[PDB]
Design a protein around this nucleic acid. Sequence first.
DNA 1: TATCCCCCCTTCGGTGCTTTGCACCGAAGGGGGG
Lengths: 553, 416
Amino acid sequence: PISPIETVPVKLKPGMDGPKVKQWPLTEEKIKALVEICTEMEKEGKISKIGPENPYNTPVFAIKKKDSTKWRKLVDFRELNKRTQDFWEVQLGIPHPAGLKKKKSVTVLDVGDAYFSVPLDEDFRKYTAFTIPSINNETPGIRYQYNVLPQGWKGSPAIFQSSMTKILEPFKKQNPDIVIYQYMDDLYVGSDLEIGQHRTKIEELRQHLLRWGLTTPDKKHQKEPPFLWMGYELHPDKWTVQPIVLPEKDSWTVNDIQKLVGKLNWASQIYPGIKVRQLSKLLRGTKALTEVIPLTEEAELELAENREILKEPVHGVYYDPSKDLIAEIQKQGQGQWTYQIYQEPFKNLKTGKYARMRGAHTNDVKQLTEAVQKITTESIVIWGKTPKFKLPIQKETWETWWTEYWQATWIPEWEFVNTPPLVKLWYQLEKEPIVGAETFYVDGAANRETKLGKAGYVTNKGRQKVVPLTNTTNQKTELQAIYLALQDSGLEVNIVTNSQYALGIIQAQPDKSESELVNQIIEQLIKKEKVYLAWVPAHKGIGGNEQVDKLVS
Amino acid sequence: PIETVPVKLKPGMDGPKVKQWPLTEEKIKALVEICTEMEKEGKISKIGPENPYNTPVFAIKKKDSTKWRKLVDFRELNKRTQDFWEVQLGIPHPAGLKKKKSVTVLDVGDAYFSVPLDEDFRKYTAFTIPSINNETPGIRYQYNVLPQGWKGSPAIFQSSMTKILEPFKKQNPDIVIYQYMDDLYVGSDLEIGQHRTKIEELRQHLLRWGLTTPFLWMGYELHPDKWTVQPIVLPEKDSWTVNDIQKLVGKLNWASQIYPGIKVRQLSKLLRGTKALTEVIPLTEEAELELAENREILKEPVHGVYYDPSKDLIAEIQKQGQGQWTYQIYQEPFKNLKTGKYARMRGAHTNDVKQLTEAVQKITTESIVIWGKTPKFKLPIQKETWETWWTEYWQATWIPEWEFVNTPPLVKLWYQ
DNA sequence: TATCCCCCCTTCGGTGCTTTGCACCGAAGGGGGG
Ligand SMILES: O=C(Nc1cn[nH]c1)[C@@H]1C[C@H]1c1cccnc1
């Protein structure tokens, strides 16, 4: 009569045994409800009773998160998950509707309790045993097992995905005109058939799924648009985020701020211009998770901007294979960028933001290379093709950067678009000493045992200044010496450091850094006209290096 | 039918579990077509979800070819495959291959398809074919024969390959043959015509053996005789400024860890005054003496550098601008084995990732010919762009183990 | 006092010399969405 589905073997850990633990007593009402549900499932056939032949069991708790007091049942499978054949879940990426193709007729099927339809392993049902105390624990417990895939277990989603793929592969082979994306519970089906032919095809697929006993309620089976699919309301010509509302709190505490940040990030997929940097800045320095952090002026400005963007709803569009993907990036400043992956003017297919700070001393060109890399990899994942960027950077600047930077970088393809704030090199250093500039010999020295040191410069003309400072590390003493040498002279200056660490920062050409010292050096170097630095082996009798070293000794 | 050879692994160390990087649409299409055909011919059989094992897979179009060839990364399996280094199936390395007029490579990888793989160890060659937009789950598969890329495949095929090689080697003792992975390295001191004729003969012999018992017509040429370790040379000059004098002192220090013969005391004495960089310091008699002696020492070839069979090989790379790269193979941070320099090529004049890819291939091929262990790279590139773009310009069939570096060397010591 | 996946942040813990402060990776745990 019915078509069974073959099992997939599982096993425990070699040498390690199964779960032997028990829980603590629950509320009498919750216990009675759970008992009713379990008896109902037993008389349905999913669950069978356990005799003395299976001594050890697994604890089971009660939850009410669904609705208010639904008495929804879940089992503490922790020990079991700690001790069984590790699995390789091959389907982990969540689909994105941007890549959906414009099917003239769409229908969404929802499978009810389909995790419970697939069977389990005979050998492992002994370890999939749980027991519930009687009503108010009058009797110590009633012991049960699962002859189906348990909800909340290591391999449950993997085995379910494999089983559904096995079931649906023949149907997909049958018709090469119908697309049937599925992620877990949902079963989107879409085709370019007529309004009646598509309905007949879906009816036949539903009967074909009833052949193995899968049940799909008509109430959950969507009929007319819109179709709410895994959080994205799919209209015939426009996907859209399911509408959300942000809290209107006046005493914002840490977790409320975190929820605001999360919802803003989640809504960033379609709303262009969302910024969260300064909003997240409050979270730095976690001290107390109960108190209320005041909303600084910058945070409230960013929050107001997010709200005024979120007032109006904006809708994306489906991908069309016959057109070419074009992306864009705008520089919001402070380390925030925006995506406008599209195919036609003013018809977005996706939108996002890049805000990660990678490196303690980086600049605009490096961050625009991390931005385009992220766009490229995400576009590969979601579309299979790399888009045609529309870069803000200018060809001359990009060439001058990539032909001279020590690593290797590459940007796939782009045309320069004129839209400020442009990305450009704030200051370009010199590679050869110039004629008509001074020469500063600087050096930093300090001791770890003293937490104090002296730094100074000895120019060619004899000018000298030794400024003693404490609590500043050696790399910092050197950085201070470079700062002094910059501050003393004019627009042009030749500076001859003796430190290996120092020069790396200045040559990297940062525009921003964590250290205020480095930020001051950047300010000075932007102010100057033509600066040339130079290295010199420390402690080798080289000109003024040892002359200032003896003074700062 | 070659009887199956049981294969063990390291005691108490599980097999390969590596994530699958996303792939483009054309590569996915080619990969799935190849996999379906290979299942039709019984080489690969679909596998279930109980496997806690996975290795990546990439599709690469090889040189002068139009059909993609499936390449499966096997680095984790090779590193954890035990006993195969000490099993006598390993090949002794011919020390005469370094000195030969020409070397040609052959695609004898397809010949491994005819030997069944051990069934107990079979669970470890699992690989997944991803899907675009996560439409479907991974289309998992598993070899049924010897894989292409595992360090044990040539080791197991040694016997059947020697049974074919010995007649040719016995007939012609001049030709030396070496085999690494899927590749046959064959060379001779003959001219181009004689070398090509002998290689034709060899390929005809292999094809006739296959008849009796991705393009098979491909051929790549190499010339080991045009490789010389390059000592660093100091700049030639007679009028010297303070900046140039001090940067040459810096270069001498940079060379102080390579040799113990460089003397810097006199030229340090020349820089006791705190003069401006632009100021011109004429060189003195003692300065010229030290400079000439040091230049002679630098011309003198490196000494104390020796191979250690139990240590790995490290191949640093420094970008020198205008499409110039360098490389320094070594085993101990001072005793460099073979330095070098890779000049620019044609077609990659605006592609640093491409140039680094070609440099990687040329370094690995060289090191295989010279010693037979590929070096552990230290690439000067961003990890994410590398992982995203190395496939589209890679055309080899073996993958070395690379680590990335983010600290700037800030050296022109090697750039002359 | 349930499981599993993507992504977005921050904290602390390991690396490597970048030498012991500094830069730079890697999970732990915090939320969003399934
Ligand atoms: O697949 C889904 N889709 C869905 C969208 N909105 N609500 C539900 C269910 C959420 C996922 C789940 C949760 C916990 C354990 N297993 C599976």
